[PDB]
C-alpha cells in the first residue's frame, strides 16, 4: 500500500535521525568552528557533490551569500561540460579547486557513499592547496573517509540508504549555518 | 553552547517529522497518484521554488530523469531567470516558463516554505490558466498558495514555523513521492 | 603585440563570417522552417552542447521562452548533469534527458564545434530513436555528427578550423533562426 | 523572405564588427592588461550579466578555469532566487560581490544597453570594495558608462541591435582570453 510505503519512509527518516543525533553533535560543532576560523581570516568555503548532493552544495552556498564567502562548484555548467568533455568527469571539481582555492580555505565535499570519484579528486586538490576538508558522507564513509587528515572533519551519517543520508546532510548544513551566525 | 544548539536542531527536526507523519501520509499519496496519472497520459511535471526550494526543485527533477520520466526544473536556466527578472520583473520568472512548456494535463510542483512567494503564486495562476494541476509544497499555514488551490490540486503543508524544518520535510516528501512512482 | 593580436581576432572573425555568408543562408532557412513546423504542431526544441556551446544552448532557449515558445536547454540542471556523469558516465548526460523529455516530432539542436562530442553524438542517437528531427551546429568538417544525419535533419557547419570563430558564427546562426521564427 | 532576412543578418553582423574593429582594439588591450595585473597579484575575476550576457559571463569564466581564478555570479540559481525573492532582483549580483570580492579583484559587468539595474549595483559594490571594472556595453554605454572611473575600462560596442552587441562581446571575450594566454 502507498499509505504504508509513505508511512515507512517517515518512520525510517525518524530512526535515521535518532541514530545520527547521538554521534554527529560533536563533529558538527568542529565543522562549524573550522568554517568560522576560515571566514574570520578572510578565507572562503568551496562546496561540491553530485545529484541531490549537488543541490545541497548550492543550498548551503546560498545560505552563506544570502554576506559570507561561499561558492558552490556545481553551478557553472559551461565549466562542468567543458571539463567533462575534454579532461573527463573525474576532474570537474578538482580543476575548480585549483582555480579558486587558496591556503586556509575550506572544501565541503558531499558524497552519500563516500566514493564519488570527482569528490575524491577535489579533496586531493584541496590538500595540495593547504585547505581543510569537511566531508559529508554516508554508509561507512568510503574512500573519502580513509583519505582525510586529523585536521579535517568527517560527518558520516550511518545509514545505508541514500535518501536518508541526504536528509541528514541538509539538517547538518542547517545546524552548521545556525552555529556560524 | 554550540553542542546544545546542534543537539536542539536534531531534536526539533525529529519532532517536526513526528508531527508531519500524523497529517501528511494521505496527501502525499494523492500527490503521487496525481503524478502517476499525468505521466501515464504522456504528460510532464514542472517544478519550481526559491532558495533552498530551488535546490529542492532540481533535486526532484534529477531523480525523475535519472526508465526516464518527464520532469523539468524551472529554476536552472540562468539565461531565462535573469532575462525575465531584468526585463519583465522577478515575479514572472516561473510563470513565463509555465506558459512556454506547460500543456493541458501536466503538473506544476510549486515549492514555497511560507506559501506567499510571489513568483510561485504567479506560476500557480499560469498553471491553472493552461488546465494544469498543482502540487503545492508549503509551510506554516500554507499562505496565499493554499488559499488559491482547486479541489483537483493537492496541498502538502508542513505544519511548522521554521523554514529550515520545512525544507527538511519537503525533501522527505519528495523522496516518498518518487518511491511511490517507482513502485508502479 | 597585444594591439596586433586583438586586431587579428577581429579580422579573422570578419573573414570567417564572410565565408559562412556564402554557404549557410539556405541551410539556416531550412533549420528555422523545421523549428516552425515543430512548434506549430505543439512540439518542443531541446538544445545541448559543451563549454561555450552549453552557454549557446541556454542562450537559444532563453530567447525562445522570453509569446512564449517551447524550448528547453539540457545543459542547465546540475543535479541531472552530475548524477548522470557520476552514476552512468559523462557521455549519457544529454541522451538521458532526451529519453526523459523528447517526443515524436520534437527537435534536438546539438551544438559541437568539432562534430565529435561524445555526449552530443549519444544525444543524436536518442533523438533518432524517439523519431525527433535534428539540427546540428558543427565546425571544421562536421565530424562524426555530420556523417550521422538523416535526410530530414539540417546540418549547419561552420567551415573554419578555430573553435573561437566557430562559436561566434554559431551565435549569429542562432540569432538569425530566432528572428526568422519571430517573423512568423 | 527568410533567405533575405538571414542574408541581412550576416551582412549586418559583418558591418557591426567592421565598425567595432576600429575603436575597440586599444580598450580591449587595456582590459586584458588589467586582468593580468589582477591575476598575477593572486586576485580573481568576477563576471555577471542578464539573458545572453549571463551566458557570456558563464562562457568567459569556463575558459579561465579550464587554471585561472574566475567566477560567474550568474550560475547559482538558489542564490539568485533567494535574493530576488527576499531582497529584490536589483541586488542579486551586488550581494555576491560583497560576499566574494576583495580589494584588487576585477568585476566584468556585461549589459547590452548599459542600463541593467543589477549590473549597476554590482559596479557600485565593486567600487566600495576597491575592485576595478570592465564594462561590456552597447549603444551609448548607458548609466554604467557614466559611472566608471579612470582605473576602470569601458568596452562599448556602438550599435543599436542587441544581437549584434552580444556577438561582438563574445569576440571581445575571446580576444581578452587569448591576450592573457599569450603573456603567461
Ligand atoms: Zn534524493
Ligand atoms: Zn535551507
Ligand atoms: Zn569560447
Ligand atoms: Zn541573444
Numbering used by the authors:
A (entry chain C): 3 to 68, 76 to 190
B (entry chain B), C (entry chain A): 3 to 68, 75 to 192
D (entry chain D): 3 to 68, 76 to 193
What do the paper's sentences say?
GmhA is conserved in many Gram‐negative and some Gram‐positive bacteria and is responsible for catalyzing isomerization of the D‐sedoheptulose 7‐phosphate into D‐glycero‐α,β‐D‐manno‐heptose‐7‐phosphate, which is the first and common step for parallel biosynthetic pathways leading to generation of GDP‐D‐glycero‐α‐D‐manno‐heptose (D,D‐heptose) and ADP‐L‐glycero‐β‐D‐manno‐heptose [L,D‐heptose; reviewed in Ref: (Valvano et al., 2002)]. We demonstrated that GmhA homologs in Neisseria gonorrhoeae and N. meningitidis (hereafter called GmhAGC and GmhANM, respectively) were interchangeable proteins essential for lipooligosaccharide (LOS) synthesis, and their depletion had adverse effects on neisserial viability.
The untagged GmhAGC crystallized as a tetramer in the closed conformation with four zinc ions in the active site, supporting that this is most likely the catalytically active conformation of the enzyme. The tetrameric architecture is consistent with the results of size exclusion chromatography, and with the previously determined structures of GmhA homologs from other bacteria. The interface area of the GmhAGC tetramer is extensive and buries 14,160 Å2 of surface area as calculated by the PISA server. Residues 69–74 (chains A and B) and 69–75 (chains C and D) are disordered in the structure.
